[PDB]
Amino acid sequence: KPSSATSLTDDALMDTVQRRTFNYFWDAAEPNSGLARERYHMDGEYPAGGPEIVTSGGSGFGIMAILAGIDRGYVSREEGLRRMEKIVGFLEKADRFKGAYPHWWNGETGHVQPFGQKDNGGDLVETAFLMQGLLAVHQYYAEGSAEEKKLAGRIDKLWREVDWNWYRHGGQNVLYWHWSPEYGWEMNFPVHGYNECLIMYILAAASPTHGVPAAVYHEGWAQNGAIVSPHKVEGIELHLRYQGGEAGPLFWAQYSFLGLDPVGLKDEYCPSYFNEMRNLTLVNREYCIRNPKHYKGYGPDCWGLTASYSVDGYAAHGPLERDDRGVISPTAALSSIVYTPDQSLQVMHHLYEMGDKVFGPYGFYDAFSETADWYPKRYLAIDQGPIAVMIENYRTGLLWKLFMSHPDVQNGLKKLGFNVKK
Numbered sequence: 001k002p003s004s005a006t007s008l009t010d011d012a013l014m015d016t017v018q019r020r021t022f023n024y025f026w027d028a029a030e031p032n033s034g035l036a037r038e039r040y041h042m043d044g045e046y047p048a049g050g051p052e053i054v055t056s057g058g059s060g061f062g063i064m065a066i067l068a069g070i071d072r073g074y075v076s077r078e079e080g081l082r083r084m085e086k087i088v089g090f091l092e093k094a095d096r097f098k099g100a101y102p103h104w105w106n107g108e109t110g111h112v113q114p115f116g117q118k119d120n121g122g123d124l125v126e127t128a129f130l131m132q133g134l135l136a137v138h139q140y141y142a143e144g145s146a147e148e149k150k151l152a153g154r155i156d157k158l159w160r161e162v163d164w165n166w167y168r169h170g171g172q173n174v175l176y177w178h179w180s181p182e183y184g185w186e187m188n189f190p191v192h193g194y195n196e197c198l199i200m201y202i203l204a205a206a207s208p209t210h211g212v213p214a215a216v217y218h219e220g221w222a223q224n225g226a227i228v229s230p231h232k233v234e235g236i237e238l239h240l241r242y243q244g245g246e247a248g249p250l251f252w253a254q255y256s257f258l259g260l261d262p263v264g265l266k267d268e269y270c271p272s273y274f275n276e277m278r279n280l281t282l283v284n285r286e287y288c289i290r291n292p293k294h295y296k297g298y299g300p301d302c303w304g305l306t307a308s309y310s311v312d313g314y315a316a317h318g319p320l321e322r323d324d325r326g327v328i329s330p331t332a333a334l335s336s337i338v339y340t341p342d343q344s345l346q347v348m349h350h351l352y353e354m355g356d357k358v359f360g361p362y363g364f365y366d367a368f369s370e371t372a373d374w375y376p377k378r379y380l381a382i383d384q385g386p387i388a389v390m391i392e393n394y395r396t397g398l399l400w401k402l403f404m405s406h407p408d409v410q411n412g413l414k415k416l417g418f419n420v421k422k
């Protein structure tokens, strides 16, 4: 029987979450650039950087959330195209470093906003998240209007300009995260797996202009098979060697899989990316259900530990006592809806039922601690984007279908030894 006291259906709940989370990128875009704000605080207080700072990677997630919105008629095609034109216009004029983008710009100036003294140039991980988004928009518009196709061409030129091979630091068989015109290679961070950065290696192999040999992946990312290290965490099998420990924060299951489709995905180092990321999600869920630190509210209907704002600032929360600060981040469980739908939907209903303190005007706020009575009315692009995109991927497979249709992406996957058997 229908009633005001009966719960939203899953579909109406997901619709509502998607509309609001889309509105984060649509209504709360930085007005000058059109890009995703790194952070947005309903309380108006910004102790560690303002809302005018725009994030390259977060904007990549956001443009995918916006694609989802165009496809559902949240906004018109025409409105959608005008936004894409604005975003691409900014990218064509903002600071770039060997065709890669910085982590942050000031949206009002187009100039790099450093994090700390030496990280004032290119960030290739962020570039990779931006490009994963941009290549999906290219495919959405490849057979569109003359105007949409024009925009797609401008994206293809940005894509072509990224010099992935530069970031090998003199032709080494690995990718470095950063490069600065001023400080060069001093950040010195070669990127080895497993962590959130797979899509970087895949896009580097995919580039039809400044692409890298397969050796860069096999030796650099996978370290000649060292990336394979089967072990159990919370009684659950993980196949991969996780950087810095036995597992990691849940976003590692998510960022590189917004456009790259994990379903039926395999390569030399993993017989199913889907199964691995599902199990990572289940390790996270299991730690929260066990709740060894006796935090309030953890359980089957409330789990999900990842990097986010935290009671004492910002922390890389994860399913290990050391990393558990009593803070649940909605993006963790919700962005894993593709891997664990029933379980992620249980969390989504339960969080929605907490009301205003957790579910705000642009969707779920970043993080909360029931134990600490800590409920910030604050958002981050990088936590918001994956909720909208992964809900869509579960519902229609939109972003996967678009990304995976890109002929360069296909060639990069073939070159690295990936196969898809669904």
Ligand SMILES: [K+]
Residues within 6 Å of the ligand: 002, 003, 004, 005, 006, 007, 008
């Ligand atoms: K109802």
